[PDB]
Design a protein around this ligand. Structure first.
Ligand SMILES: *[B]([O])([O])[C]([N]C(=O)[C]C1=[C][C]=[C]S1)C1=[C]C(C([O])=O)=[C][C]=[C]1
Length: 263
C-alpha cells in the first residue's frame, strides 16, 4: 500500500530530480513510515554516529578510555578538520574526537575513531553486534563520500539506520551513561538547522547528524522530541545523478515537514 504521506514524499522526490529515502519510527506506537526504506544510500558523515557509538561501547569496560590522548600529526589532516587542525602536533582525547566528529563533522576526528576501532570493518562489527545487518563502513574519510550510484561501499538503508539510531539513543544498545552522552552530543550538533530540523515546528527539540558527499548527497539522521509526545527517530537520505550536484538540504527539510504534518 501507498499512503498519503508516501505519495507526498514521491511528489517531493519527483520535483527534486534525485532519489529520496525516508524512515520514521514513532515511539508513541512503534509505527513506521518508509519511503525507499530498503534501498541503499551512501551514508557520508552520518556514519560518524556509528563510530562514536562504538567507542562509547568500548568505554563501558574502560572507564578512562574517553580521556585517552590520541596524537594528531600534520599528515592526519584531510579535507575538513576544523577542530583537529587546532591540535596538530598535540593530542585530543577520544571524547574530544567524538564531540568534534559529531558536532562539527570533523573528518580527521572520524578517522581517529575508525582507527581506535581497528579500521572501517570495526565500525561494521559494532553495527552487527547491535543487530544492524545492513550498515557497512568500507573506507575512511574522505573517500567514504564518493557516493557513486550503485556502489554498496559505505551505505545503509533508511529502515536499518532508523532502527539502529533508536536502539542507540532511546534503547539499550549502550549503557545508560553512554546513551545519555550520545544524546548530549547529538543535541549539540552545529550543522543541522537547515536539514530535518528546518521542517519541524520550532517548539520541537532534536539532536541530529548531517552528511554530505559527492553526487549532491545530502543526508540527516535525527532523534526528535516533539511538543507533547513521545520521541521520533527520522532518517532522510538524498542523492543525485551528477557527481558535481549541489547540496539540497531543503529537500530534507521538506521531507521532515511532510512527516511532521502526517502525524
Ligand atoms: B561527511 O563525510 O559527510 C563530510 N563530508 C565531506 O568531507 C565532503 C566530501 C569529501 C569528499 C568528497 S565530498 C562532511 C560533512 C559535513 C556536514 O555534515 O555538514 C561538513 C563537512 C564535512
Amino acid at each position: 500500500q501507498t499512503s498519503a504521506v508516501q505519495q507526498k514524499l514521491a511528489a517531493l522526490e519527483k520535483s527534486s530530480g534525485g532519489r529520496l529515502g525516508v524512515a520514521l519510527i514513532d515511539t508513541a506506537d512503534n509505527t513506521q513510515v518508509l519511503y525507499r526504506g530498503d534501498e541503499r544510500f551512501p551514508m557520508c558523515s552520518t556514519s560518524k554516529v556509528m563510530a562514536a557509538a562504538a567507542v562509547l561501547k568500548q568505554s563501558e569496560t574502560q572507564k578512562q578510555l574517553l580521556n585517552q590522548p590520541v596524537e594528531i600529526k600534520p599528515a592526519d589532516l584531510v579535507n575538513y578538520n576544523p577542530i583537529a587542525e587546532k591540535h596538530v602536533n598535540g593530542t585530543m582525547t577520544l571524547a574530544e574526537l567524538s564531540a568534534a566528529a559529531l558536532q562539527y563533522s570533523d573528518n580527521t576526528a572520524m578517522n581517529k575513531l575508525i582507527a581506535q576501532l581497528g579500521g572501517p570493518g570495526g565500525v561494521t562489527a559494532f553495527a552487527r553486534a547491535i543487530g544492524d545487518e545492513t550498515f557497512r563502513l568500507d573506507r575512511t574519510e574522505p573517500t567514504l563520500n564518493t557516493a557513486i550510484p550503485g556502489d554498496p561501499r559505505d551505505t545503509t538503508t533508511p529502515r536499518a539506520m532508523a532502527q539502529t539510531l533508536r536502539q542507540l539513543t532511546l534503547g539499550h544498545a549502550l549503557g545508560e551513561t553512554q546513551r545519555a552522552q550520545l544524546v548530549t552530543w547529538l543535541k549539540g550538533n552545529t550543522t543541522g538547522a537547515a536539514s530535518i530540523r528546518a521542517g519541524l515546528p520550532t517548539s520541537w527539540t532534536a539532536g541530529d547528524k548531517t552528511g554530505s558527499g559527492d553526487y549532491g548527497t545530502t543526508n540527516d539522521i535525527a532523534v526528535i522530541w516533539p511538543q507533547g509526545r513521545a520521541p521520533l527517530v527520522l532518517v532522510t537520505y538524498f542523492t543525485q545523478p551528477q557527481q558535481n550536484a549541489e547540496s539540497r538540504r531543503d529537500v530534507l527539510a521538506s521531507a521532515a515537514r511532510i512527516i511532521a504534518e502526517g502525524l
